[PDB]
Design a protein around this ligand. Structure first.
Ligand SMILES: CCCCCCCCCCCCCCCCCC(=O)OC[C@H](COP(=O)(O)OCCN)OC(=O)CCCCCCCCCCCCCCCCC
Ligand SMILES: CCCCCCCCCCC1=C(C)C(=O)C(OC)=C(OC)C1=O
Ligand code: SF4
Ligand code: SF4
Ligand code: SF4
Ligand code: SF4
Ligand code: FES
Ligand SMILES: [Ca+2]
Lengths: 905, 589, 210
């Protein structure tokens, strides 16, 4: 289609409305209620443009550019006097009841309403009467609520209900007394409530964690990074001020995490700002604790390493690719051990084998929203990989989108989309040990142990293609449900199969792979998705190594007299007693970490590593996409005593000092080239982000905005002489505003969104080729592997039916979004949010034990008689005990294990 | 129809003559808010266009400005030829009362332009400054060396990739090796200028007058060759007062750049503020009310009286009479009391704003203005009868460093010298800015030669005219607003900021990120206290200036200096330095 | 509660060593030193050196409407040898830092340094490539003046502060007998001294009045 704006001819996409058709070309129209992902509702009436149907038309009509399709031959005027006066009047009407709260507002300089008040040129107030006020609700530890600043643009209710699926936020009130919130006070229990701080154009829903230690947007030092709290790897923009991480903002990735994060990744950053964190290298002689800087620590570590017969290294799925590779090259290829256990590594290797060898195209997170029928086997997505659950909700609403598009309704008429599709939605079949958070839209939910879920998957795979291995012994009711799932999946056009290593079983992944292979054999565009546990689980599995049991038995047998533990707590993947014995037995433990782990008492040397905010690196998400996360700040700028370096830098300098007795602090590009040289299958991480020599017309990229303040006074308490700003030799960014952050620069890594006249999170519209689509000049991060030409065979080893053995209790994993991450539970803001540790029991088994809810049951696992209060789970199957993974003293390695001595105490 | 509108300027006769001479496909015309015909001309035809403008029936006999520009980051270049760098030549025809801006486009690799020194001899320092700050080479230039930065300097400061702040670079550590290297780099090497040190009979002796000389009015160093007392030639070395104010214009916002514009000429103040804020108001589309124009005219004339008083006192002291400078500084204290009353500061007021002024006039400024207007003329008559009619001062001043109209035109001389040469080109009359048409005041024009005495009494008559303007402003003062009602007026009025929310939003977004001027180009040329000061502002649509070019008259006067003092004595050079009215902050910026 | 500086040319400027020592102050030598300090602080000859705006304000202070001559500090010699005080009044540019270092070396002790203005104190408003961030990067400064420009009576107040600094300092009477190190008193800061009279200020006159 071809449109005419003010006499200028523009080629646009005719399936789009006029608002983002003009926003794609760079034409500024004020707007509040429209969002690129939600749709158009025509509420705020701010997007008015004067439309003409002929080339010679004087009057025209003031039409809504978010509600008028951009067909071929529309002559719209934006800067006309009538349209500008009406837009100014709408801004004025929104400004009649707005409070005088801008200095004391958390979105000052980040406000969409401020940008559209200055954009329309409204600065004179002739309203003289009183302003309406509203009370505020306590929405929990995350969201600060201030309803006086609202403009009734209906974005919060639209996102939270029609997009996030939440049920506790709604619109109440009257004519002008419109309220947006809960029917009472209490925590917003949705797992995607954190995006309300950027969906809301005003300062109603604000980040309370940021509001504790608050600084303005221009005071933030930003960086592009990857969220480390689970395996999805959503792109984030960490921003710091005064040496502590202040706020995690959303970063636009058109393929992964376009406009929405989750609460664990958005509010779980509080572990970085802990004072218990090691900031200097600390060495122990017996009970004496001394502090060294980098050089003497490196020389002493190299001396003790040379005085040992075999140095072993225990990596972690939390650390980056470069740091794990540095440990591997420091300790040797054969002596490198992955920090995960044997079962977790087996499930991870199977998931990687299905991904990069199964011949089935695994889709990205943006591509999930277009799949028709979704089968989730084993994985509790909403509490582990929550963004995949949100994309699953979008793919479910795709059916109503399809019926709406069949009735000649444009895609941006979202109200008509839910109008036509009242309750009809795509099939979703979830399996878990209990009820999930996806049960509101799921076509079926199977509450069963992992053996029965795996057998259900094998039954689906056999009933699709008869060459698949059959399971015998299914009840006819479950057989009818199997037939229903088969009819739903076979009749679809883009089936999706979602599994992962969080189910605690291998046969679940085998069954999901067999279902995907059977769907592929019938001639369908089937996709698969394995959700891993940690952020860099996939990269550690790709690199490989031994299990934690092998490292512990090397330490216990005496063949390893020196162990380097890289960013691992070692109690999350093994028992605490065995780890403590194997570490006290070893005469040298060197823990390189940025967190005060429990094993640092046994550590002979502690090396203060850097977290994601203070280190550069590459992480591989759950779909094989290599992504580079950059440094936000130099920790030594404010606290000059702080010797806190990148873990790969620590290990590479230790390797160099061990070899040639010289200390050589390397660069990130050298380590990246070493990875892509020694490991052929990690060669794609060179293309994840360009090197430190990349310039936009000769200059670097700025980490802080052009109006960064207090350069000559933020360090004046220590010394009045402002030092040289830190130099980033590793990456292409600089710790200064002398850099390029234009929206039209030929780059993919964007630290923050800012345009002249666009200060809100809506400033991301200028950084894309089309608004709501991919990022301009391509999205960052590349896939490590392609789809194979041929796939795997049928996994024949079906499991047996779950028969509850007396005495032994199978442990059913109950993952929580707030508490199952190793680092997110260390945040002090999650302690007021995470639930209490409850052991979950069937009513029948609790009645057999005689225990009621509330009382304490003690259970012993490897000499640890730990007591937990009891919650009753009706959906849990008999013979199991429900345990929360990742909590205090309950490791995720407990999944699938037995539990003897379960008595009331 | 407002004066700030983008005028494409095809109605200029010079565009018609250029179309008829070079054809309809030789140059492009740019529509800007500068009020200037902007002609993009190919590099091969630059010398032909310069000769054509030099040989017009009413020709462009003035090279007002010559400077480069980095266009590598300018996103909004619609209607513009493709260019990585550009060079603009601003030329003035006085008899036409017209001016033109010729821009030549250069790629990043092919950064060489034909020289402009032969057509206009004052292009030497401008081409040196363009080479120093942008790296652009001029073919045929005699001595292409750095003029702002020292010879031991790597990189070009005004390029977009060069960092601006000293905290980004390493801090200044002065070691023995660096001190020795920088002291040897600052040493004058006479073979590099072809000085011909010595003669077959007797040797010439080289003297470094500046920096730190009681007659050198600032950071100015001149290296002067003497045979006995006589001067053979002069090498004026500048760059000892460089502050990088243009790079600061690319570093500060529109509102926060006002103190930096104020410190460009530290005896100018509001006179330095006026072209910048007028160019910003041209960019925004703001028409200021009458009271704002009267207030800014009054402050400009007050600071003009202050600057002329200082200039007269320094000239009298440089001749040798050390007495009247104390009384002149007492009248400066009276002016400082008035300026403290109005703006709140003595000498760097930082008071002018976009679309108005900072505060309103306090209750009682007319009393202090009446006291100053009573105090001034008797003191001026005393200074005249004590020193400016002295025959010793006349002997030291009359006939010393005299030049005609052709030397004042080919060297870019403006202000007192240009009017003393008989060229009646005053900005306050020919191109009246800020409502100068509402004030009646005469223009002093000399007899055709620029002596030191002629310049000094022309500045005395300018002081008397400024006193007349102040009297007219005091007797007739409007009663209106002190800020414009435009939404882009920065900052908004304070009381509406304090008790309205739209005004609070506007003020909040205008002091934090800065006002968002649209992507356009503006120019404002005014008559400063020392000559003609002009601001050329290119906006990329952002909240900062994409390019800030400041043309100052003291630069052209200092470049003229070797052509008007050659063959004279050192005493004549001292009197000439005292009778130019230059400051080195104006020269080096 | 004093400090000692010892100078020796034979790397990084300033070429001196400073330590924290105790005042040694002798029934006639102490009064002799007091008389010498009185004569030194009651006759100061400032150097006629100027860089920028702040020099114009310094010579505004030099005139007959403020009359710094009353303190015996109007002499204003243009030679570094005859001068007794370097007032760095202006911006310390990059190309002039060798010139200022040379002019400080040509000066003779007893010598004192007064930084005038924000450019000389810290680099001021010009955080730019071609300006040394503060003149104290290479020369020791005795008295600091905030301002841009400092008003003339602020320069006079700094001159009196330098006089109080001279009046309580120990210098060698003769260059042949005694120690040649320079003892300068660590006086109480004027911020701490004036905190008593500055916090108690309650009401000022509104800006609309003249
Ligand atoms: C105890 C002893 C001291 C007692 C104290 C009281 C007496 C003080 C006496 C001070 C004497 C100062 C003499 C200064 C002489 C300067 C002469 C000079 O250089 O004149 C040159 C000047 C210009 O000459 P011009 O012809 O233009 O240049 C030729 C270039 N082609 O020529 C001109 O401008 C023309 C006019 C020249 C005037 C020459 C001086 C006249 C007499 C001295 C001044 C008056 C002193 C007081 C007299 C008594 C008052 C009651
Ligand atoms: C004789 C005591 C001072 C009298 C009052 C000031 C006299 C005029 C000073 C002029 C001047 C200025 C402004 C000046 O900026 C300067 O350069 C640093 C000079 O050289 C030292 C000057 O002479
Ligand atoms: S939401 Fe925006 S307009 Fe409202 S008080 Fe906050 S910053 Fe001001
Ligand atoms: S609370 Fe925010 S998102 Fe919701 S209607 Fe009001 S302004 Fe819109
Ligand atoms: S889904 Fe995972 S990667 Fe994404 S924001 Fe949440 S915790 Fe971070
Ligand atoms: S501190 Fe201010 S007045 Fe002094 S030299 Fe610097 S800019 Fe000029
Ligand atoms: S954006 Fe169109 S009415 Fe709100
Ligand atoms: Ca780094």
């Amino acid at each position: 289609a071809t449109i005419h704006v003010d006499g200028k001819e523009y080629e646009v996409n005719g399936a789009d409305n006029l608002l983002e058709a003009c926003l794609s070309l760079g034409l500024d129209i004020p707007y509040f209620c429209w969002h690129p992902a939600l749709g158009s509702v025509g509420a705020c009436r701010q997007c008015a443009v004067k439309q003409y149907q002929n080339a010679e038309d004087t009057r025209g009509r003031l039409v809504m550019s978010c509600m008028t399709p951009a067909s071929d031959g529309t002559f719209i005027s934006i800067d006309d006097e009538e349209a500008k006066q009406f837009r100014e009047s709408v801004v004025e009407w929104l400004m009649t009841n707005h409070p005088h709260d801008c200095p004391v507002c958390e979105e000052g300089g980040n406000c969409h309403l401020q940008d559209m008040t200055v954009m329309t040129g409204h600065s004179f107030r002739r309203y003289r009467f009183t302003k309406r006020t509203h009370r505020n609700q306590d929405l929990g530890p995350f969201i600060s609520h201030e309803m006086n600043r609202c403009i009734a643009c209906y974005r919060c209710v639209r996102y939270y209900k029609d997009y996030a699926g939440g049920t506790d936020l709604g619109v109440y009130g009257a004519h002008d007394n419109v309220y947006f919130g809960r029917p009472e006070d209490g925590t917003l229990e949705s797992e995607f409530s954190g995006n309300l701080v950027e969906i809301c154009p005003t300062g109603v829903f604000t980040d309370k964690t940021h509001s504790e230690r608050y600084n303005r947007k221009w005071d933030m030092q930003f960086a592009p990074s990857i969220c480390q709290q689970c395996s999805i790897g959503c792109n984030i923009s960490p921003g710091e001020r005064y040496g502590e991480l202040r706020r995690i903002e959303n970063r636009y990735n058109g393929t992964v995490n376009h406009y929405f994060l989750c609460d664990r990744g958005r509010f779980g950053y509080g572990y970085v700002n802990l004072k218990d964190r090691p900031r200097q290298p600390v060495q122990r002689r017996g009970d004496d604790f001394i502090t060294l800087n980098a050089e003497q620590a490196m020389q002493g570590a190299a001396d003790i390493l040379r005085q040992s017969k075999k140095v072993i290294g225990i990596g972690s799925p939390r650390a980056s690719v470069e740091s794990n590779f540095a440990l591997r090259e420091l300790v040797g290829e054969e002596n490198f051990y992955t920090g995960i256990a044997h079962g977790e590594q087996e499930r991870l290797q199977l998931a990687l084998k299905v991904l990069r060898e199964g011949g089935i195209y695994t889709p990205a997170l943006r591509e999930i929203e277009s799949y028709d029928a979704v089968l989730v086997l084993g994985e509790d997505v909403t509490q582990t990989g929550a963004r995949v659950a949100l994309a699953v909700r979008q793919a479910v609403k795709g059916k109503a989108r399809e019926m709406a598009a069949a009735q000649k309704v444009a895609d941006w008429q979202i109200a008509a989309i839910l109008n036509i599709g009242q309750r009809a939605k795509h099939p979703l079949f979830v399996t878990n040990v209990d009820d999930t958070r996806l049960d509101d839209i799921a076509a079926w939910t199977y509450r069963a142990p992992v053996e029965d879920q795996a057998r259900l998957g094998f039954a689906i795979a056999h009933a699709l293609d008869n060459s698949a291995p059959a399971v015998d012994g299914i009840e006819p009711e479950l057989q009818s449900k199997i037939d229903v799932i088969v009819q739903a999946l076979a009749g679809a056009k883009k089936p999706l199969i979602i599994s992962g290593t969080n189910a605690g079983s291998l046969e679940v992944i085998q069954a999901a792979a067999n279902v995907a292979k059977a769907l592929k054999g019938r001639g369908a565009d089937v996709g698969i998705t394995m959700i891993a546990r940690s952020v860099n689980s996939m990269g550690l599995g790709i690199m490989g190594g031994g299990s934690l049991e092998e490292a512990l038995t090397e330490l216990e047998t005496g063949r390893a007299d020196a162990v380097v533990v890289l960013e691992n707590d070692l109690h999350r993947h093994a028992s605490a007693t065995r780890v403590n014995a194997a570490l006290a037995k070893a005469p040298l433990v060197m823990v390189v970490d940025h967190q005060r782990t429990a094993i640092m008492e046994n550590a002979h040397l502690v090396l203060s590593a850097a977290s994601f905010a203070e280190s550069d690196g590459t992480v591989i998400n759950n779909e094989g996409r290599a992504q580079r996360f950059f440094q936000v700040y130099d920790p030594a700028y404010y606290d000059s005593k702080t010797v806190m370096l990148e873990s790969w830098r620590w290990l590479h300098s230790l390797h160099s000092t061990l070899l040639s007795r010289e200390v050589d602090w390397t660069q990130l590009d050298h380590v990246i080239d070493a990875v892509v040289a020694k490991i052929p299958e990690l060669a794609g991480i060179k293309d994840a982000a360009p090197d430190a020599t990349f310039r936009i017309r000769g200059q670097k990229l700025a980490r802080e905005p052009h109006r960064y303040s207090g350069r000559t006074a933020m360090r004046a308490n220590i010394s009045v002489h402002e030092p040289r700003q830190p130099q980033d030799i590793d990456t292409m960014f600089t710790f200064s505003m002398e850099g390029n952050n234009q929206p039209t620069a030929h780059r993919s890594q964007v630290p923050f969104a800012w345009a002249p006249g666009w200060n809100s999170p809506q400033a991301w519209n200028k950084f894309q080729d089309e608004v709501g689509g991919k990022l301009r000049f391509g999205d960052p991060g590349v896939r490590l592997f392609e789809t194979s030409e041929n796939g795997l065979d049928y996994f024949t080893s079906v499991p047996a039916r779950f028969q509850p053995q007396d005495g032994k209790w199978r442990i059913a994993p109950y993952y929580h979004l707030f508490g199952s991450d190793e680092l997110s539970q260390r945040a002090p803001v999650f302690q007021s949010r995470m639930p209490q540790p409850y052991i979950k029991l069937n009513p029948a088994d609790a009645a057999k034990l005689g225990v009621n809810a509330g009382t304490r049951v003690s259970f012993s696992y490897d000499g640890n008689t730990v007591t937990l209060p009891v919650e009753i789970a009706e959906g849990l199957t008999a013979g199991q005990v429900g345990l929360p993974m990742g909590m205090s003293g309950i490791a995720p390695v407990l999944a699938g294990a037995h539990l003897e001595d379960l008595k009331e105490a | 129809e407002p004066a700030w509108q983008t005028r494409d300027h095809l109605d200029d006769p010079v565009i018609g003559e250029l179309r008829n001479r070079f054809g309809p496909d030789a140059f492009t015309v740019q529509a800007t808010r500068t009020g200037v015909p902007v002609v993009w001309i190919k590099r091969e035809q630059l010398l032909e266009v310069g000769d054509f403008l030099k040989k017009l029936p009413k020709p462009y006999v003035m090279l007002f400005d010559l400077h480069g520009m980095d266009e590598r980051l300018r996103t909004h270049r619609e209607g513009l030829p493709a260019a990585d760098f550009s060079v603009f030549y601003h030329l003035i025809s006085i008899d036409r009362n017209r001016d033109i801006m010729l821009k030549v486009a250069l790629a990043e690799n092919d950064l060489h332009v034909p020289t402009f020194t032969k057509l206009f001899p004052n292009a030497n320092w401008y081409e040196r400054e363009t080479w120093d700050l942008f790296g652009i080479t001029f073919d045929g230039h005699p001595n292409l060396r750095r003029i702002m930065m020292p010879q031991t300097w790597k990189g070009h400061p005004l390029r977009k990739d060069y960092p601006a702040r000293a905290t980004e670079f390493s801090p200044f550590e002065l070691t023995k090796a660096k001190q020795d290297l920088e002291m040897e780099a600052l040493t004058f090497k006479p073979e590099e200028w072809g000085m011909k040190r010595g003669t077959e009979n007797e040797d010439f002796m080289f003297l470094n007058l500046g920096p730190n000389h009681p007659s050198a009015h600032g950071a100015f160093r001149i290296v002067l060759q003497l045979d006995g007392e006589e001067i053979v030639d002069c090498v004026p070395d500048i760059g000892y007062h460089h502050r990088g104010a243009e790079k600061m214009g690319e570093r500060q916002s529109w509102h926060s750049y006002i103190p930096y514009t104020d410190r460009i000429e530290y005896l100018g103040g509001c006179v330095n503020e006026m072209p910048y804020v007028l160019a910003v108001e041209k960019l925004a589309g703001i028409t200021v009310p009458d009271r704002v124009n009267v207030i800014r005219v009054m402050l400009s004339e007050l600071f003009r009286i202050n600057s002329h008083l200082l200039y007269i006192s320094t000239f009298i002291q440089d001749v040798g009479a050390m007495t009247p400078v104390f009384f002149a500084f007492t009248d400066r204290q009276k002016i400082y009391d008035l300026v403290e009353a109005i703006t709140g500061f003595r000498m760097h007021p930082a008071w002018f704003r976009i679309g108005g002024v900072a505060h309103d006039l306090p209750r009682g400024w007319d009393r202090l203005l009446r006291e100053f207007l009573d105090w001034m003329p008797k003191r001026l008559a005393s200074y005249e009868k004590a020193a400016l009619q002295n025959t010793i001062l006349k002997g030291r001043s009359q006939g010393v460093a005299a030049y005609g109209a052709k030397e004042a035109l080919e060297w870019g001389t403006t202000g007192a010298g240009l009017r003393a040469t008989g060229i009646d080109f005053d900005v306050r009359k020919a191109r009246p800015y800020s409502g100068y048409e509402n004030f009646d005041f005469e223009i002093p024009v000399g007899g055709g030669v620029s002596d030191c005495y002629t310049r000094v009494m022309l500045k005395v008559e300018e002081l008397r005219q400024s006193l007349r303007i102040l009297e007219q402003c005091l007797n007739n003062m409007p009663e209106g607003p002190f800020k414009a009602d435009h939404p882009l007026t920065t900052p908004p009025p304070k009381e509406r900021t304090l008790q309205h929310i739209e005004t609070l939003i506007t003020h909040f977004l205008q002091v934090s990120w800065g006002p968002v001027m649209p992507a356009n180009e503006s120019f404002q040329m005014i008559e400063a206290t020392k000559g003609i000061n002009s601001y050329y502002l290119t906006s990329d649509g952002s909240t900062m200036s994409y390019r800030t070019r400041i043309r100052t008259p003291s630069y052209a006067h200092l470049q003229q200096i070797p052509a008007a003092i050659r063959g004279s004595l050192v005493s004549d050079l001292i009197v000439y330095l005292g009778s130019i009215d230059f400051v080195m902050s104006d020269v080096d910026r | 509660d004093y400090t000692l500086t010892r100078i020796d040319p034979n790397d990084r400027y300033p070429l001196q060593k400073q330590e924290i020592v105790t005042d040694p102050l002798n029934v006639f030598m102490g009064k002799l030193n007091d008389m010498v300090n009185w004569g030194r602080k009651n006759s100061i000859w400032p150097y006629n050196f100027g860089l920028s705006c702040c020099y114009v304000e310094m010579v505004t202070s030099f005139t007959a409407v403020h009359d710094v001559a009353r303190f015996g500090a109007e002499v204003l010699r243009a030679s570094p040898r005859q001068a007794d005080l370097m007032v760095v009044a202006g911006t310390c540019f990059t190309k002039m830092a060798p010139v200022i270092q040379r002019l400080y070396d040509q000066m003779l002790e007893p010598k004192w340094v007064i930084s005038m203005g924000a450019c000389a104190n810290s680099g001021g408003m010009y955080d730019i490539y071609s300006v040394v961030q503060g003149v104290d990067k290479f020369i020791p400064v005795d008295v600091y003046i905030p301002g841009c420009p400092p008003r003339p009576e602020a320069y006079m107040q700094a001159l009196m502060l330098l006089q109080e600094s001279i009046g309580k300092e120990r210098r060698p009477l003769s260059w042949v007998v005694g120690d040649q190190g320079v003892y300068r008193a660590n006086m109480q800061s004027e911020r701490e001294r004036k905190r008593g009279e500055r916090i108690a200020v309650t009401n000022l006159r509104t800006p609309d009045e003249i």
